[PDB]
């Protein structure tokens, strides 16, 4: 520049598929399986202390991993360089991923010993059974079936309705629901999916703090904010998503507690008896999970990334991948027991102490394409306007210093002081993370160049070149 | 100093086959019917001997 920052773009934003050439050099990577054994309901901590002994792990929460990748320009190379390192720079493209489940078919389960529930109002049994002191019951559910996986390279955006706070312009008091304002935030590991009360916080909306389970009270519940993400052309925040979700209405119920609502008292006619009074108009549909089937598994089959939502196809502008997984369908909870004493020789429920765990597996197989971004002066100006940090990291002119001189604290040694001594010694240092809240997967040298002996690999050779297998695949008929 | 430095690859082992030439001679076999009729709730064993009753 000038002209001008550039032009044009904006408008029309140049794709990274017009000057970023693919190469036929392939490396292969994968993980060694991942296993995390939690307690979905709550983490089990030592209550004499504050540290976890069993974490919280669940498929009914987002499992969001921050994958850090090498860069090809760190290599000594096996000789993948035939040109000057300043006419081009190298970046990865990920062209296939399979995300495996090692968990059997069967659901996980959540519940609450005191879920806020009055009476049954699907078909009556009461108007109220209580409006004084207590009325909550032992009730469990498995939250709705959600399967989705989505892949990006910058952090995903979630939406949820946060607490818009009661206003005093229009009459809303405590004991009236607030106006609700949508407060959107990054999808991060440990966070709960939508429950079908809407996707909202429950940490400060809830004030009994015991309407719902131990798990969702203490999370933010979120719905994916597809909408802002698919409107970024580049799609660096995601360049792949899919979903399958469903839920059915188990039974209508009424919440524990009295109306806070204002009912116009002129939309009915008064009765006599039971029909004189009103129940609480705080009806809620009770939701419940769906039937699990092996034809609903979007997993253990490969998601290609040869093409992507974004201009991005896994192109490294940080050398990171974000992979978010939800699987509620193999999120088996396995039940077990240990006997408290062998002093009790009869069957007692004060003898054999039931315990639940959830075991969580994930494996990710990856095929990596080596790609290049060819740099001319004009290209370099576009990137500079785009994100300057990329140029510096690559290393590219024009840098000051010099620099110099003197220094201080001279001779001796100490020696007393003299001399100097100021002293004064440097670097706190401080501070931004940039962690933020993710299950760290380091890949740096799991990279390969054979892909005939990885299962993903074999299928990728089949798809790409129509060879090699190596001998044969399938049937026939069968 | 790094390491990596490709090499790379990991890894390449021999194909089970690549030179299996299928002869046009074929044979057939079979079993007559394999059957078993048990008890689905529990093995019924004879306690005096050690052998199944069902």
Automatic annotation (TrEMBL), chain A:
<protein>
    <recommendedName>
        <fullName>Major capsid protein L1</fullName>
    </recommendedName>
</protein>
<keyword id="KW-1145">T=7 icosahedral capsid protein</keyword>
<dbReference type="GO" id="GO:0019062">
    <property type="term" value="P:virion attachment to host cell"/>
</dbReference>
<keyword id="KW-0946">Virion</keyword>
<comment type="subunit">
    <text>Self-assembles into homopentamers. The capsid has an icosahedral symmetry and consists of 72 capsomers, with each capsomer being a pentamer of L1. Interacts with the minor capsid protein L2; this interaction is necessary for viral genome encapsidation. Interacts with protein E2; this interaction enhances E2-dependent replication and transcription activation.</text>
</comment>
<dbReference type="GO" id="GO:0039620">
    <property type="term" value="C:T=7 icosahedral viral capsid"/>
</dbReference>
<dbReference type="GO" id="GO:0042025">
    <property type="term" value="C:host cell nucleus"/>
</dbReference>
<dbReference type="InterPro" id="IPR036973">
    <property type="entry name" value="Capsid_L1_sf_Papillomavir"/>
</dbReference>
<dbReference type="GO" id="GO:0075509">
    <property type="term" value="P:endocytosis involved in viral entry into host cell"/>
</dbReference>
<keyword id="KW-1015">Disulfide bond</keyword>
<dbReference type="InterPro" id="IPR002210">
    <property type="entry name" value="Capsid_L1_Papillomavir"/>
</dbReference>
<keyword id="KW-0426">Late protein</keyword>
<keyword id="KW-1162">Viral penetration into host cytoplasm</keyword>
<dbReference type="Pfam" id="PF00500">
    <property type="entry name" value="Late_protein_L1"/>
</dbReference>
<dbReference type="GO" id="GO:0005198">
    <property type="term" value="F:structural molecule activity"/>
</dbReference>
<keyword id="KW-0945">Host-virus interaction</keyword>
<comment type="function">
    <text>Forms an icosahedral capsid with a T=7 symmetry and a 50 nm diameter. The capsid is composed of 72 pentamers linked to each other by disulfide bonds and associated with L2 proteins. Binds to heparan sulfate proteoglycans on cell surface of basal layer keratinocytes to provide initial virion attachment. This binding mediates a conformational change in the virus capsid that facilitates efficient infection. The virion enters the host cell via endocytosis. During virus trafficking, L1 protein dissociates from the viral DNA and the genomic DNA is released to the host nucleus.</text>
</comment>
<dbReference type="InterPro" id="IPR011222">
    <property type="entry name" value="dsDNA_vir_gr_I_capsid"/>
</dbReference>
<keyword id="KW-1164">Virus endocytosis by host</keyword>
<keyword id="KW-1160">Virus entry into host cell</keyword>
<comment type="similarity">
    <text>Belongs to the papillomaviridae L1 protein family.</text>
</comment>
<keyword id="KW-1048">Host nucleus</keyword>
<keyword id="KW-0167">Capsid protein</keyword>
<keyword id="KW-1161">Viral attachment to host cell</keyword>
């Amino acid at each position: 520049a000038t002209v001008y920052l550039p032009p044009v773009p904006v408008s029309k934003v140049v794709s990274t598929d017009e000057y970023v050439a693919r190469t036929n050099i392939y490396y292969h990577a994968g993980t060694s399986r991942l296993l995390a054994v939690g307690h979905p309901y709550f983490p089990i901590k030592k209550p004499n202390n504050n540290k976890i002994l069993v974490p919280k792990v669940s498929g009914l929460q987002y499992r969001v991993f921050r994958i850090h990748l090498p860069d090809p320009n760190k290599f000594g190379f096996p000789d993948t360089s035939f040109y000057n390192p300043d006419t081009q720079r190298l970046v990865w493209a990920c062209v296939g991923v399979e995300v495996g489940r090692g968990q059997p078919l069967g659901v996980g389960i959540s519940g609450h010993p005191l879920l806020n529930k009055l009476d049954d109002t699907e078909n009556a049994s009461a108007y109220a059974a209580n409006a004084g002191v207590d009325n909550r019951e032992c009730i469990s559910m498995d939250y709705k079936q959600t399967q989705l996986c989505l892949i990006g390279c910058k952090p995903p955006i979630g939406e949820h309705w946060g607490k818009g706070s009661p206003c005093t312009q229009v009459a809303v008091q405590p004991g009236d629901c607030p106006p609700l304002e949508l407060i959107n935030t990054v999808i991060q590991d440990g966070d709960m999916v939508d429950t079908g009360f809407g996707a909202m916080d429950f940490t400060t909306l809830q004030a009994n703090k015991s309407e719902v389970p131990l798990d969702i009270c203490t999370s933010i519940c979120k719905y994916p904010d597809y909408i802002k993400m698919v409107s970024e052309p580049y799609g660096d925040s995601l360049f792949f998503y899919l979903r399958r979700e469903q839920m059915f209405v188990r039974h209508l119920f009424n919440r524990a507690g009295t109306v806070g609502e204002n009912v116009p008292d002129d939309l009915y006619i008064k009765g006599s008896g039971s029909t004189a009074n009103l129940a609480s108009s705080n009806y809620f549909p009770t939701p419940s999970g769906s039937m699990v089937t092996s034809d609903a598994q979007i997993f253990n089959k490969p998601y290609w990334l040869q093409r992507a939502q974004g201009h991005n196809n896994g192109i490294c502008w940080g050398n990171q991948l974000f992979v978010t997984v939800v699987d509620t369908t193999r999120s088996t909870n396995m039940s077990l027991c240990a006997a408290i004493s062998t002093s009790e020789t009869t069957y007692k429920n004060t003898n054999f102490k039931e315990y639940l765990r959830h075991g969580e597996e994930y494996d990710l197989q990856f095929i990596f394409q080596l790609c290049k971004i060819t740099l001319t002066a004009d290209v370099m100006t576009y990137i500079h306007s785009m994100n300057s940090t990329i140029l510096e990291d690559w290393n590219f002119g024009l840098q000051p210093p010099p620099g110099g001189t003197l220094e201080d604290t001279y001779r001796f040694v100490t020696s007393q002081a003299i001399a100097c001594q100021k002293h004064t010694p440097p670097a706190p240092k401080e501070d931004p993370l940039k962690k933020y809240t993710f299950w760290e997967v380091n890949l740096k040298e799991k990279f390969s160049a054979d892909l005939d002996q990885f299962p993903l690999g074999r299928k990728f050779l089949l798809q790409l070149g129509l060879k090699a297998k190596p001998k044969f695949t399938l049937g026939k008929r069968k």
